[PDB]
Amino acid sequence: MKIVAIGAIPFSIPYTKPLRFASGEVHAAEHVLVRVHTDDGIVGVAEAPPRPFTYGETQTGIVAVIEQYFAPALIGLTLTEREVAHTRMARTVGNPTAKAAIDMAMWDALGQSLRLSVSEMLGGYTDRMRVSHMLGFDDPVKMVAEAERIRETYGINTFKVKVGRRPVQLDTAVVRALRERFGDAIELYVDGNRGWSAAESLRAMREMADLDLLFAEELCPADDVLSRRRLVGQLDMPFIADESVPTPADVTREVLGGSATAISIKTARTGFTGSTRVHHLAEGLGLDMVMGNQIDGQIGTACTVSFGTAFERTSRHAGELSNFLDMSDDLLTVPLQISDGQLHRRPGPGLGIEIDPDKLAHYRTD
């Protein structure tokens, strides 16, 4: 189980409909397929989604850091030297998805080598997660229509509404329309992607005080430090930190500083080894955690569910596992299936997925 090579292949798949939010937009999945090859002939895979408006990574940059720094530093290690790989990669600052992809591909290879799913190796608490869908910006009537379509089609009963627009009433009207249309039959929460000021955020949440929102996520910039802390202290529900807590150290600083009262865990940025560190830190501190979506393709979603199903604290909440549906196509030989508002972790070893050679050949851009 020795790593003989690590590759980074850029690919691009158009979105049927772009996902828009306060911090940016995604019109295509311009990701990087990361592959870890072992001396046993096994190939572990994962993807790295470049999100310049979240981490500052670019597709070109991810391929570069992997080919120029990480691959050379990890070749020669075995799949059971994860902490050596973790420590070596840590010598390089940032580059979250590049690091996470390598870690997850290593876990995929390990699982295949041992005939065990990543989920069970991590803890195997359960076999499925409830699904939460992120509703991107769009005309009010269109967002409600999208929610209705998704709920009826896939049985999804949890929605995270993208907000952070002006005037604030535009978003509060959308959330109210959703609650009036579905009643208490659905769970609702919001994500502002740093779009509102702390003051606007409070006014918005106060207006929606009767809508039973479960969480408030990154309503204002965490970097508006003092006003952010004041806002978090004013809200009843937990305030989920996401882009502001990419590492365990950030979790500690933001939580102890009062700028976060809940934590988003995204395998796209902390993989499995790093995500376990976040889960354990959050559980130890006593904070709620939710599996988030990095506007993942099916490869990344398979990773999210692999980790989320491994622990009780992550599976007690719905996981954001459905935005891949807006992609026009994907790279798996067998597409992920969401039914009854749930997504099961794959039954196969590792991530339980396989890359379709024809799809990769068609969408790769190298």
Give the CB-nearest residue to ligand MUC. Answer: 54
Query: Is 21 among the residues that bind ligand MUC (CB under 6 A)?
Result: yes
Q: Is 178 exposed, middle or buried (0-12, 13-18, 19+ CB in 10 A)?
A: buried
The correct pick among 4, 145, 285, 334 for binding a second copy (CB under 8 A) is 285
Note if 25 is an active site residue.
no
For residue 242, state whether it binds Mg ion (rule: CB under 5 A): yes
Write out the binding residues for ligand MUC, residues 283-322 only, by CB under 6 A.
292-295
| Burial of residue 236, with CB atoms counted within 10 A of its CB: 0-12 exposed, 13-18 middle, 19 or more buried | exposed
Q: How far is the CB of 321 from ligand MUC (least distance, A)?
A: 12
| Cα-only R_g, the chain | 20
In the chain, how long is the greatest CA-to-CA distance? 59
Calculate the CA dihedral of residues 66, 71, 77, 81 and round it to 10 degrees.
Answer: -10
Residue whose C-alpha is closest to residue 43's, from 357, 362, 364? 357
> Interacting stretch for Mg ion, rule CB under 5 A, among 173-181, 194-202, 211-219, 331-339?
211-219
In angstroms, the CA 347 to CA 269 distance is 24
Detail the residues annotated as belonging to a binding site: 191, 217, 242
- Kindly state whether residue 251 participates in binding a second copy, applying the rule CB under 8 A: yes
Taking the complex as a whole, the smallest distance from the CB of residue 228 to ligand MUC amounts, in Å, to: 16
Q: How far is the CB of 236 from ligand MUC (least distance, A)?
A: 21
Would you call 226 exposed, middle or buried from its count of C-beta atoms within 10 A (0-12, 13-18, 19+)?
A: exposed
Q: DSSP secondary-structure letter at 183? A: G
CA distances from residue 180 to 10, 151, 222, 331 in whole angstroms, order as listed: 43, 15, 31, 38
- Please name the residue that has the structure tokens 């009767």: 210
In the annotation, is 294 catalytic?
A: yes
Is residue 217 flagged as an active site residue? Answer: yes
What gap in Å lies between CA 302 and CA 184, rounded to an integer? Answer: 29
> Minimum CB separation from ligand MUC for residue 366, in Å?
23
Alpha-carbon separation of residue 242 from 33, 261, 264, 299, 326 (angstroms):
24, 11, 5, 21, 22
Catalytic residue among 59, 112, 294, 298: 294
Catalytic annotation present for 67: no
Q: For residue 319, what are its two tokens?
A: 């996981």
**Residue 99 catalytic?**
no
Residue 191 near Mg ion by CB under 5 A: yes
Smallest separation (angstroms) from a second copy to the CB of 244: 16
CB contact at 8 A, 125 and 315: yes
Contact pick of 31, 35, 37, 51 for ligand MUC (by CB under 6 A): 51
- Closer of 35 and 194 to ligand MUC (Cβ): 194
Residue 191 sits in the site that holds ligand MUC (CB under 6 A)? yes
What mask of x and - would describe binding to ligand MUC in positions 128 to 167, judged by CB under 6 A?
------x---------------------------------
191 in active site: yes
Q: How far is the CB of 278 from a second copy (least distance, A)?
A: 8
Q: Quick one: 187 or 191, whose CB is closer to Mg ion?
A: 191
Q: Looking at beta carbons only, is 55 or 355 nearer to ligand MUC?
A: 55
Q: How far apart are CA 324 and CA 29, in angstroms?
A: 9
Q: Considering the candidates 160, 187, 218, 266, report the single residue annotated as catalytic.
A: 266
Catalytic (active-site) positions: 162, 191, 217, 242, 266, 294
